[PDB]
Design a protein around this nucleic acid. Sequence first.
RNA 1: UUUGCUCCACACAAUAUAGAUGGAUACGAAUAAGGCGUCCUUGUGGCGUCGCUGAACCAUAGCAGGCUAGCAACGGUGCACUUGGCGGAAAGGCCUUGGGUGCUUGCUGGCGAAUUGCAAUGUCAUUUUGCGUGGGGAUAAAUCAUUUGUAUACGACUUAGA
RNA 2: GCAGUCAAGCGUUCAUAGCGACAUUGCUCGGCUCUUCCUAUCAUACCGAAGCAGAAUUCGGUAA
RNA 3: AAGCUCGUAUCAGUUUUAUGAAUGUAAGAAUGAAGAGCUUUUAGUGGGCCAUUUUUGGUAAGCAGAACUGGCGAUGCGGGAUGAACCGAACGUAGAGUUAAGGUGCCGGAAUACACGCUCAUCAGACACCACAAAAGGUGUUAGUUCAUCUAGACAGCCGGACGGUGGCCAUGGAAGUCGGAAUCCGCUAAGGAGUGUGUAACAACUCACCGGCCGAAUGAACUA
RNA 4: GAAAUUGUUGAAAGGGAAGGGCAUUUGAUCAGACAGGCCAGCAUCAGUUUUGGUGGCAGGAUAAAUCCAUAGGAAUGUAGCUUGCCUCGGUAAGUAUUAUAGCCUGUGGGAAUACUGCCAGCUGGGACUGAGGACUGCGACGUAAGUCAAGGAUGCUGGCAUAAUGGUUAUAUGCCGCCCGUCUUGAAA
Lengths: 232, 69, 197, 190, 170, 36
Amino acid sequence: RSKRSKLVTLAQTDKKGRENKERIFDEVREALDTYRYVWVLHLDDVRTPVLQEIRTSWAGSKLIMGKRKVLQKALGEKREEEYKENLYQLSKLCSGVTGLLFTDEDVNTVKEYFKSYVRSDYSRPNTKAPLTFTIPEGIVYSRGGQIPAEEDVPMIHSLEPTMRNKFEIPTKIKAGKITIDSPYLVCTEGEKLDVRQALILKQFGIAASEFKVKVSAYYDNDSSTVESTNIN
Amino acid sequence: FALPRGARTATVSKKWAAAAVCEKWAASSWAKKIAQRERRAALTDFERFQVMVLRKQKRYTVKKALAKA
Amino acid sequence: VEPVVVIDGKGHLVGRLASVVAKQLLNGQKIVVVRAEELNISGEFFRNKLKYHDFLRKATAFNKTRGPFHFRAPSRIFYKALRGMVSHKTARGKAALERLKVFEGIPPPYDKKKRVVVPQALRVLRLKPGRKYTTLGKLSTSVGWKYEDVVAKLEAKRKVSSAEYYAKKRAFTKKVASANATAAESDVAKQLAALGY
Amino acid sequence: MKYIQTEQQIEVPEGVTVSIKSRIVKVVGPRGTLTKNLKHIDVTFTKVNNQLIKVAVHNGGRKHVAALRTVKSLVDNMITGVTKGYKYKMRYVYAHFPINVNIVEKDGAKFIEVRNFLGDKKIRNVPVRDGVTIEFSTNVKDEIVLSGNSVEDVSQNAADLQQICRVRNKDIRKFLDGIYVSHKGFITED
Amino acid sequence: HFKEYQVIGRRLPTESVPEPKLFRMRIFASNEVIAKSRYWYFLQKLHKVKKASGEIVSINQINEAHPTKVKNFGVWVRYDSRSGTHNMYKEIRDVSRVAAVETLYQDMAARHRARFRSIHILKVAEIEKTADVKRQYVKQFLTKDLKFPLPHRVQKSTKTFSYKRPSTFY
Amino acid sequence: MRVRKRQSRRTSTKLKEGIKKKASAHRKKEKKMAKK
RNA sequence: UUUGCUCCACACAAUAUAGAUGGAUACGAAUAAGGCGUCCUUGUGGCGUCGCUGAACCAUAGCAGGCUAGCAACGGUGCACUUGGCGGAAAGGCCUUGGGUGCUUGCUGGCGAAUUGCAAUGUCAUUUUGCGUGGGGAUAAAUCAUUUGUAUACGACUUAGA
RNA sequence: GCAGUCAAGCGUUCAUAGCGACAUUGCUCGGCUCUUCCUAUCAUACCGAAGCAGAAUUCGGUAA
RNA sequence: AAGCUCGUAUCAGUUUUAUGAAUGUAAGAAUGAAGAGCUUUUAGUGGGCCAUUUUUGGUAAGCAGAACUGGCGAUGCGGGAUGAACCGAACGUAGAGUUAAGGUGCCGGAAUACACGCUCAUCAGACACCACAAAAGGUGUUAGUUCAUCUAGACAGCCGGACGGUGGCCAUGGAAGUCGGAAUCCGCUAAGGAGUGUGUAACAACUCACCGGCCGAAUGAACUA
RNA sequence: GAAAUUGUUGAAAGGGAAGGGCAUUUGAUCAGACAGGCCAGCAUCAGUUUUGGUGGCAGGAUAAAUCCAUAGGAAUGUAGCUUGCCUCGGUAAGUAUUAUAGCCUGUGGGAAUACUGCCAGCUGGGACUGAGGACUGCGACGUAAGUCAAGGAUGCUGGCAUAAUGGUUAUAUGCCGCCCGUCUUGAAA
């Protein structure tokens, strides 16, 4: 007794367990013999319609993501446990995030694509943002110090407790509008970010940090070798 | 002392004698105090009278040792 | 063993303390509990206070000058705990109680005198670690007694004088313990050893 | 299930030193010293390597182990209390009547006078604890800063300062007036 | 204090049915007479027999095989309650089977208020390999080089008055 | 505070013996109800 | 009051004892901690040691403790004179300055004990007194009666008067 | 309250030997005066909830 | 009480075996006893209350009728603190030993025994066919049982994704998942509900359920005691 | 010239009852024997009983164990060996069946002891009791005569010889103890 009661809930979606992980196990292994080459992507973070943009970019080649430890034991961890010959040389190289790309295409077409592909995204924690920004010292606006104020709407008064408590910025509301008194800096150019700093830049809708999706290693079926390519 | 776990009697006797915990026991003040009470218990009345006389003599020399410093 | 027996009723347990004093008497042994205030009971404060308080609620309805005399003083507070523990309406009782003496704090000639304890009523031993007890000094105060402070004051000062006495003592002891050690290995000595002493 | 050994690890940084006999704790370091009695708690401290401290409960029920973790928390709070310090920023808001907060020193008590709260002739006197220092925020309107070493001193004084300004027999929704802890933090940010 | 008994019975040899199946079981009791009575009580429940229909053929004290080696026992117990009867598995670290069932009976009375007449000891087994020992309070003592103190010791007084103010060091 | 009245733990002899009669009444009911 | 009353000394009777019969032998605090010894950076400090019972420690040998001969050492102790300091919680006692004075079983000698008949508490304690002694010391109030009226059923109270 | 709807389980196995809680759905001898006590408090004291703008109030908590 | 026989084989609140549809018989079965039968006549006596076990009826619940059985009555004593029916107990006067029921902190005679456990109670509990308020509530605590996850990384914790058809249809001033009425479907994945709550007039924004990233051993749910 | 009831004198007791029973202290008072009595101590005995010490056996798996000899195993893994990264050598992650710790299981051997039961085994301590009164009996030892613990206590020794036993009595103390008679009823009341 005297234990934490788990927050009881009535939502439609349920857990997956080992069933889904075995499906991804079988899908990776059955995609290995079919497709020629395997690219292991170190895509740190991705907006979901960007991945759907990647799926709609080519339907032929298959992209399977998911748990690292599912992909490790599907491809092969060591010398003894391996699907195909010298396949474990790349599983030792994939460290962080999910991404893995089966392909039946040209090598230089793929590496041309991912070097040419870069999209504007939100600035992240532990990465520097290339903007030095201060919020104006009158009424704070929805876009917030990026566009002319006459083309902008003032922020919703309902999210001011989020600004004061969670984002730390000193706010008070006067006649339905959020107001600060002095100009307040949040980030400066070439400087490492905190969690809350990225959340202020997110809330003001500022997407001023580029995202280039990267790959680290590369496989060949017939040559029985693993190639390593450092592009960003 | 160093004893491996679950040691049978012979192993206990091996490490018992090798570490010499019996002599380390007899060296301690605690065994000397136990032996002290046992010595006083089995004292004869005449031997107890010897203690009477010897404590009188020891008292004399000790009282002379004091009242000097 | 002695004519009188002075108990240091500190960190004790009223009950087990009284019960070990009670019979002690009936058997004709003179006894004098001291440092009563510092005495102990058993159970989160409030607990006891609430307890006593209900006792402090019992009075001879029609004439409350006649009913249960409610005593505050830690002494009396612990004389009633020992009283009702002895056929105190008979003669053999009155005669018993009469050789009992409770003192809140330690006055003379008890001060300058050895003072024992009662293991079987020692809170430290009896109680289980981490279990609220309720000192006696508190309960008393928070119910009527009004000399908590004084005693305190008069107690601190009673120790000092005590300390110093000691100091002087530890010294004279050392001196004797050193001389003795120097009397070792002297026929006589040597011998005694063989006869433990 | 009555644990045989339960231990926590109090991590000691470079600047501070921890001296413990029985259950009284020194935290001597850069900003100053802090002391705390813990003889109510019944634990055992162990210094392993002059930079890590091991609290210990042997033969403890769920109630005794629940005490075991709170020692680690309190001693650590003294450590961060000396290394980083504590800084509580209180912002006071008013609708009509300007709240007038000042520091007075009558008989060496260092009181905080809270005047004119909601148009009130009563002059609220808040005692200042030994080890908490009060300054006002420059260039920011209506802000009082509470800073010191102990968490209890700073936070209880912050609680006192906002419980004297109770909106009495009125609305909560309509009357905003009061003093409020806007930010709980440290003196030295890193 | 207990004793283990092998008690056998084979419902008295009559005409047309010679030498029946000799039903053997191990019974924990204090003496031989109680063991015999408990055996008949169990036989009436395991199948439809009676005390008068059979005979005790052999009663034998089963001494413990190695009363010097500390074992890790697992005891399957079932017992009548305030409600219906129910199974229970308690794990006991002890030297002998007699001593382990002893600690069980006192624990069953202490935590479940079941007397001697309620408890049906099903099976006492040695758990040979550790990390198969299920209960955590037993696995608590199976750690490597276990060094634990006994803080706060009581000193048992022989008299009423002491002259020390006792020191509960260890 | 004004400490309110405490319930007794002295069971009077009328209560104690009446407890026994009520108990044996519950038996005679339970033996009859067992048959149905 | 025919020196009545108190206080010191020894003296005889009595009267009792909820119960002497070697010694009530003084740190404080903590208990998941302490005591003592030593040392130093003087500290909630290092190093050593102790407890696990007062089963201790101090006192303890002499006709219920006599009489004497010594030897060794400047000790131990009793008694009464005595310099102070200390003690207010019921202090009523604690240490100390010295002179005298017996005794000492520290060690060694010489006398005396018995017949209390094989045991009979075998009386050695401490109160409360009274009668005697031989020395000090100290020189009353209260009640009734009268009055008073701040009091008053009567008592009681407050007063007043050589 | 009666009847039904669910229905944790138990029924000698067990839902088709049966009992079955909270809900829910069906229409419908009296009085004068004093002392003491109880709280199950009308007021006075302090609080919590309430479209509680203020005032006024409603419910609730501690409280004899 | 008196007389006359046999002092016996005259029997018994009992068991066994057999005969039978808890009661019926017989025994050259057992065990127990020396107090048996027959006349004659002479006092007192002619209520019941309590409880246990069978059994038939009953009901919110108590219960009501028989039979048989104890107890009290004509009976002291030990115990249950106290006492009409509760536990013990073959009453001359004494001595010694041992016990019954009940007990062993002190009152109070006898262990502040020993051993394993459980309990902290804002008036605990010592109580008793474990009977009444009693079915439950509780983030008190200790044991269990049955299903679950888990080094293909368990629970907790932050960090991120949490998608496009799609602002699905009616609704209506304005309802984009989140005032409401009905299905509640497809695709894309590692996974994302015609949407779990906060929110705006409407959107937005946040949240979780679902995944994924570091973190590295246990944890989760439903019941029983 | 009784008792009720009262006075005086002497003793004693008395904190919201008294008188009563068992036992004793205390105070008061009294009886004999002394023309062998009162109280005791020790020894050896007998009956009932309580409490220790020590020896011999016998039973079970002819204890089980331990211990020893042999054959296999895994470990909370032992020495060694390999490896990682550091405060110099500690730790950690593999091997390694014990090598420079040990443990478990199996087979065999020769023992001890616990527990249980018996001895018409021995040897102590303590308590209460001594009834009967020439001899018969049953016995034991003794070569026999005789002796004895065998059909119930004798032997030795001491104090006192009266208030020292004990009694009566007033009180104290521990424990117990409804107010009798009647009449009711199943009882109490």
